């Protein structure tokens, strides 16, 4: 029977061979069956046979009289087959007809996919109007939302609604947020303990970001002002010090007792659901400035979602690594530092919304700087998390993470020729993160903690690898000094807290605390940020809150 033969083929797709055979079987009894040929085309293009599908679709009878559901499928197929004009005219004919009819599932789907197509067609405003009409059609609201506030508040999530209403809400909210214009200003105070003069780091960073829509994506302009202070050297006597910094180990230094520097950087970039790219500069005003940037591509493969990126970034772990330092004017006066890491990375993830989720990442970078020994690194990271609580407004998870690092050379020292950044020969870390995210009508927050165990080893390294920089007289001394290697393992912990409050439709404020004690020498951060939305966002806030990230940390 035609009905059951059609049903058997259709049930699979909500899958190729059986459905195609069933559709062909219906084609024997009734060669003019429009639904059978539509299903055959759908299954063919689901297999990626676009070239055959576009030829098959032309065999359908004319649209002299057909239901809205069939015309919606035809329009979607034509749009995805690459014939945008026929789909555009079909939707232009369909949408007023959908509006004229009372609220129904057919008309709701027609308006939803029409809004989606119009958003892809290059008319986001008409897409927003069509979404406004679709919410009326889908039963979300009895009356059309006349202003941005009532339009946005209807997009808040609902636990009792069906799939159609939830999809309409999610799509309307996503499009509205994509079309919004945002201005964010954030202040970061960060640093870590160390030795005064080269490692007693305290830094301030003021970040200004403008986010605007462009095509289906968003473009961003970013400006960063960063000030780094590392204290002053402790003089032993006669106004001289002999710390393990620069060439002071060969001759007691003088002159540059205090060390600090500030600079401004710019960045411009763009990002969409698939592609992302960004280019900018190292903060101008430091000793050494280099151009940095990155590009990234993301796509789904099977059940997994993968991302491949290539980037060049600075290292902000210390002043010598980020902006570089100058040797004391009494000994050499030469400039050195400014380590840049350029390389590639590939990441995979799996999360279908259920209780379990996994992710992994691998990266390979080359580290090169001004008068700094060349280096390279390979890094592996992975994580798994089980969601104890997985409500749409409240998530509580506990998981296990693993990290493995290897570096070619250990250049953690601050002597001339070394970059002063952490670089172990073999590092392993296992952590157990516990996380809780929640949001309310006007409050959103995230709390996180993690205990970890880490092992690290570093090899013996010469103190002055760049022998040509050392003066001829000190040569015999410089070859006789080396930094002793060693291995160490132990426990550590990290904690984080994010909070965000909506005080006005166009005004959001938030604070973030990041404490690092996992024996990784990472600096601790404390930031306050304010965000202004031109159109206003009265719907559900971000979960978690999403503060800005310093451009040097990308």
The DSSP-derived string for 154-184 is TTS--SSS-HHHHHHHHHHHHHHHHT--EEE
Question: Which of 403, 388, 305, 317 lies closest to 349 in space, CA to CA?
Answer: 305
For residues 132 and 134, give the distance between their C-alpha atoms in angstroms, rounded to a whole number.
5
480 located within any domain: yes
Q: Output b/e per residue, 524-546; b: 16+ Cβ within 10 A.
A: bbebebebebeebbbbbbbbbbb
How far, CA to CA in Å, does 194 sit from each of 197, 230, 272, 451? Answer: 9, 9, 41, 23
For residues 429 and 39, give the distance between their C-alpha atoms in angstroms, rounded to a whole number.
52
90 located within any domain: no
Contact by Cβ (8 Å): 114, 95: yes
Instruction: Please give the backbone phi and psi of residue 105, each rounded to the nearest 5 degrees, phi first.
Output: -65, -45
What number of CA atoms fall less than 13 Å from residue 219's CA on the CB side?
7
Q: DSSP characters for 347-402?
A: EEEE--SSSEEEEEEEEEEEEEEETEEEEEEEEEEEEEEEEEEEETTEEEEEEEEE
For residues 161 and 274, give the distance between their C-alpha atoms in angstroms, rounded to a whole number.
30
105 located within any domain: no
Q: At 13, is the secondary structure helix, strand, or coil?
A: helix
Stated resolution in angstroms: 3.4
Per the structure block, which two tokens stand in for 389?
A: 């609580």
438 located within any domain: yes
Per the structure block, which two tokens stand in for 139?
A: 């039963």
Where does the chain break, by residue before each gap (C–N > 2.5 Å)? 14
Q: What region does 132 belong to: left with phi over 0, alpha with psi -120 to 50, or beta? A: alpha
Q: Which residues pair with 185 in a beta bridge?
A: 208, 530
For residues 517 and 524, give the distance between their C-alpha atoms in angstroms, rounded to a whole number.
9
Alpha helices in 62-104 (DSSP H): 68-80, 84-100
71 located within any domain: no
Question: Which of 244, 343, 348 lies closest to 305 in space, CA to CA?
Answer: 348
Q: Tell me, what CATH number does 455's domain have?
A: 2.40.160
How far, CA to CA in Å, does 528 sit from each of 72, 206, 428, 547? Answer: 48, 10, 33, 9
Question: Which of 459, 363, 369 lies closest to 408 in space, CA to CA?
Answer: 459
For residues 479 and 491, give the distance between their C-alpha atoms in angstroms, rounded to a whole number.
36
For residues 44 and 188, give the distance between their C-alpha atoms in angstroms, rounded to a whole number.
54
% helix, strand, coil for the chain, step of 5: 25, 40, 30
462 located within any domain: yes
State the total domains in the chain: 1
Q: What region does 445 belong to: left with phi over 0, alpha with psi -120 to 50, or beta? A: beta
Domain limits for position 459: 182-553
449 located within any domain: yes
47 located within any domain: no
Instruction: Please give the backbone phi and psi of residue 195, each rounded to the nearest 5 degrees, phi first.
Output: -100, 130
């Amino acid at each position: 029977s035609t009905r059951i033969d059609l049903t058997l083929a259709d049930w699979a797709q909500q899958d190729y061979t059986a459905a195609r055979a069933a559709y062909q079987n219906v084609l024997t009894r009734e060669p003019a069956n429009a639904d059978a040929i539509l299903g055959l085309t759908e299954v063919d293009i689901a297999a990626g046979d676009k070239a055959a599908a576009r030829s098959q679709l032309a065999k359908l009878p004319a649209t002299d009289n057909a239901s809205l559901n069939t015309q919606r499928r035809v329009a979607l197929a034509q749009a995805q087959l690459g014939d945008t004009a026929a789909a555009q005219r079909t939707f232009n004919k369909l949408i007023p007809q959908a509006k004229s009819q009372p609220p129904s599932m057919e008309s709701a789907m027609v308006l939803r996919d029409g809004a989606k197509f119009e958003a892809q067609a290059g008319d986001p405003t008409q897409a927003l109007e069509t979404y406004k009409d679709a919410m009326v059609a889908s039963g979300v609201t009895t009356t059309r939302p006349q202003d941005n506030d009532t339009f946005t508040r209807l997009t808040r999530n609902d636990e009792k609604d069906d799939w159609l209403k939830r999809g309409v809400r999610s799509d309307a909210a996503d499009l509205y947020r994509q079309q919004d214009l945002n201005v964010t200003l954030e202040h970061d105070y960060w640093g870590s303990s160390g030795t005064g003069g080269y490692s007693d780091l305290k830094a301030h960073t003021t970040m200004l970001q403008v986010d605007a829509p462009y095509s289906d994506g968003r473009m961003f302009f970013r400006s960063d002002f960063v000030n780094m202070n590392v204290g002053s050297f402790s003089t032993n006597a006669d106004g001289k010090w002999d710390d393990n910094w620069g060439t002071c180990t060969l001759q007691d230094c003088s002159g540059n007792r205090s060390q600090s520097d500030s600079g401004a950087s710019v960045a411009v970039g763009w990002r969409n659901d698939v592609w992302s790219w960004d280019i900018g500069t190292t903060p101008m005003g430091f000793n050494v400035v280099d151009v940095v940037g990155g590009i990234s591509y993301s796509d789904d493969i099977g059940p997994l979602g993968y991302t491949v990126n290539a980037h060049r970034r600075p290292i902000s772990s210390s002043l010598l690594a980020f902006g570089g330092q100058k040797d004391s004017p009494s000994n050499t006066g030469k400039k050195w530092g400014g380590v840049r890491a350029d390389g590639v990375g590939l990441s995979l993830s799996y999360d279908k919304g259920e209780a379990n989720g996994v992710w992994a990442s691998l990266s390979g970078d080359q580290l090169t700087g001004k008068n700094v020994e060349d280096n390279w690194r390979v890094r592996w990271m992975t994580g798994y998390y089980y969601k104890v609580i997985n409500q749409n407004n409240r998530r509580v998870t506990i998981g296990l993470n693993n990290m493995i690092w290897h570096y070619d050379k250990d250049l953690s020292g601050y002597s001339l020729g070394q970059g002063g950044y952490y670089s172990p020969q073999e590092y392993l870390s296992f952590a157990i993160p516990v996380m809780w995210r929640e949001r309310t009508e006007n409050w959103s927050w995230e709390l996180g903690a993690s205990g970890s165990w880490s092992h690290s080893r570093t090899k013996t390294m010469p103190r002055y690898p760049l022998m040509n920089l050392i003066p001829t007289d000190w040569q015999e001394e410089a070859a006789r000094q080396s930094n002793d290697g060693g291995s160490s393992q132990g426990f550590g912990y990290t904690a984080r807290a994010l909070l965000e409050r909506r005080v006005t439709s166009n005004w959001f404020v938030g604070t973030a605390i990041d404490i690092q004690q996992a024996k990784d020498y990472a600096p601790s951060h404390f930031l306050l940020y304010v965000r202004y939305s031109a159109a206003g966002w009265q719907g559900d806030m971000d979960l978690p809150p999403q503060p800005l990230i310093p451009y040097a940390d990308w």
